[PDB]
From a paper:
In the present study, we have determined the crystallographic structure of hUPP1 at high resolution, both in ligand-free and BAU-bound conformations. Specifically, one of the three pocket arginine residues (Arg64 in hUPP1) is bent away from the anion, leaving only two coordinating guanidinium groups, one from each subunit of the dimer, to bind the substrate. This finding may imply that in the human enzyme this residue has been adapted to ligand recruitment from the cytoplasm rather than ligand binding in the active site. Determination of both ligand-free and BAU-bound forms of hUPP1 allows direct analysis of the conformational changes induced in the enzyme upon substrate binding. To this end, there are only subtle differences in the fold and residue orientation between overlaid monomers of hUPP1. However, there is a dramatic inter-domain motion between monomers leading to 3–5 Å changes in the relative positioning of the loops undergoing the greatest movement. However, the 'open' conformation of hUPP1 provides the opportunity to potentially develop a novel class of allosteric inhibitors of this enzyme that lock the protein in a functionally disabled form, with its catalytic residues too separated to lyse substrates.
In contrast to expectations, hUPP1 is dimeric, having lost the higher order assembly (trimer-of-dimers) that results in hexameric rings in more primitive UPPs.
Author numbering:
A (entry chain A), B (entry chain A): 16 to 310
Write the structure that this text describes.
């Protein structure tokens, strides 16, 4: 009913398409039979996070078998692992806008070639919080830039193309519901600032280059807060932009590992951090299980 | 004589510094004894490229031993591997501006803590050529943006900071000399366009999103060419910017794998591609061996 769509007329005019970073191709792979049942896609930085994710969701669905399962489906690029169980796909996207951007182009084409429809896609991860306790889950309403605007700027053949970065409103409400229902941890909705850079792009004071003070950083974070920002990470903006353009229902669910208004490093004990790390996974696998119990 | 420098007053005011992505710290590691002899640093995308690099350079220097050597020095982040042989360091930086940017912040601090001076740093890699035969080596004069300008734009606490992206002129001349001396492959000097994005950022026609034609892409590439651009990759701009700011003598040496003025995919046979892949390594290890025979 909402099919995945490409916005590229050149594709229809091709002999074959190779998804270079997955080593999948239209000449060799039957996409509809492989991926046509896919309804939920979860994405995150590392293969180990996405592998823990698929094992959690498989157990929840009763699809967990005694053998050596959830094999990586794809190849050629270590940054990208892909796992599948029933209607769920779990894909790592690596670090930074360029790395997730390549993955999303090829993922969206995969899902298009598979004739997927009504696809929900959710990014999970960690983030620095602004004015929240360590361990709070943020469901992103808009993924904003360094001026706190809901816009992603892409340069296309030397020209600025501005795309909006709203997450899917209904999906946001559904995730918030799941969380209020679970009542296992503080969850808020807020905006998420997506930076390109970690040391200077986030107002950290420990870079090789820094032209500002603690006091300068605090003023900037206080302004981000007043503009609706609750957390900071590095992949959400391009994620949001491309997913709505191509007809995917997108959300971002990040846990905070610290409050940047109190300084730049993580105080929580190892055992505490490790329970925070599982929070986005907990919410999203619970949400998927709920959705597949009402289907 | 040219010491590595930090441009960060906050550092002097710290108890300890942790290089998070290398798992190295000032409280545990004696940086001057570990890295103070470092004069040459080669950087590239993948651990396997940088591991092939260090083994090539070690053999050239007579430092290659019969045992299981060039162990990865660092840990905690798969994207970053670090190898050392004599005064040479080889470091992988992963894919895209954000990933190399984190590595460079921590590398520059490492070299500063080690009290390194007269450090030459060189990025090796592959690229798409503009108006060059497949397999041509480009020594980058300036790493330019999507409008072909020698500038890198960084957002710092919401503000535009523009930094210049010239490579070190003298290093460029020295590398060109080594290449004319070797006479093993076509080498040019030219500008290198650094894009953030691969599918749309480079005018490719096979993205999930594409608002332009073959004819549009060609006009853009022809304009890049007329502005001095000879190749396209994804890490050189921030590399150039940060290295001159911090007192490193920087160069970029990329081989071209195709001519984008003839289309978007790589025609060369596997055996040919594999010999191209070694060209940047060949030039740079030869250059280092030359430098260490005149010391
Ligand atoms: Mg891309
Ligand atoms: Mg950085």
């Amino acid at each position: 009913d909402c099919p995945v769509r490409l916005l590229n007329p050149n594709i229809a005019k091709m002999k074959e398409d190779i998804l270079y970073h997955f080593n999948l191709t239209t000449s060799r792979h039957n996409f509809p039979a492989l991926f046509g049942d896919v309804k939920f896609v979860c994405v995150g930085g590392s293969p180990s996070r996405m592998k823990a994710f698929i094992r959690c969701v498989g157990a929840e669905l009763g699809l967990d078998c005694p053998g050596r399962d959830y094999p990586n489906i794809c190849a050629g690029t270590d940054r990208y692992a892909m796992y599948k169980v029933g209607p769920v796909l779990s894909v790592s996207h690596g670090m930074g806008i360029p790395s997730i951007s390549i993955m999303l182009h090829e993922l969206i084409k995969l899902l298009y070639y598979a004739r997927c429809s009504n696809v929900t896609i959710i990014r999970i991860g960690t983030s620095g919080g602004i004015g929240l306790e360590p361990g709070t889950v943020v469901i992103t309403e808009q993924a904003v830039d360094t001026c706190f605007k809901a816009e992603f700027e892409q340069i296309v053949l030397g020209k600025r193309v501005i795309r909006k970065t709203d997450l899917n409103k209904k999906l946001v409400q559904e995730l918030l519901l799941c969380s209020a229902e679970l009542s296992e941890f503080t969850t808020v909705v807020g905006n998420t600032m997506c930076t390109l850079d970690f040391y200077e792009g986030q107002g950290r004071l420990d870079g090789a280059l820094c032209s500002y003070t603690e006091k300068d950083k605090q003023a900037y974070l206080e302004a981000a807060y007043a503009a609706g920002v609750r957390n900071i990470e590095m992949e959400s903006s391009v994620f949001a932009a491309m997913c709505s353009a191509c007809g995917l229902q997108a959300a971002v669910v990040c846990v905070t590992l610290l409050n940047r208004l109190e300084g730049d490093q993580i105080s929580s004990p190892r055992n505490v951090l490790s329970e925070y790390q599982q929070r986005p996974q907990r919410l999203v696998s619970y949400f998927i299980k709920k959705k597949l119990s009402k289907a």
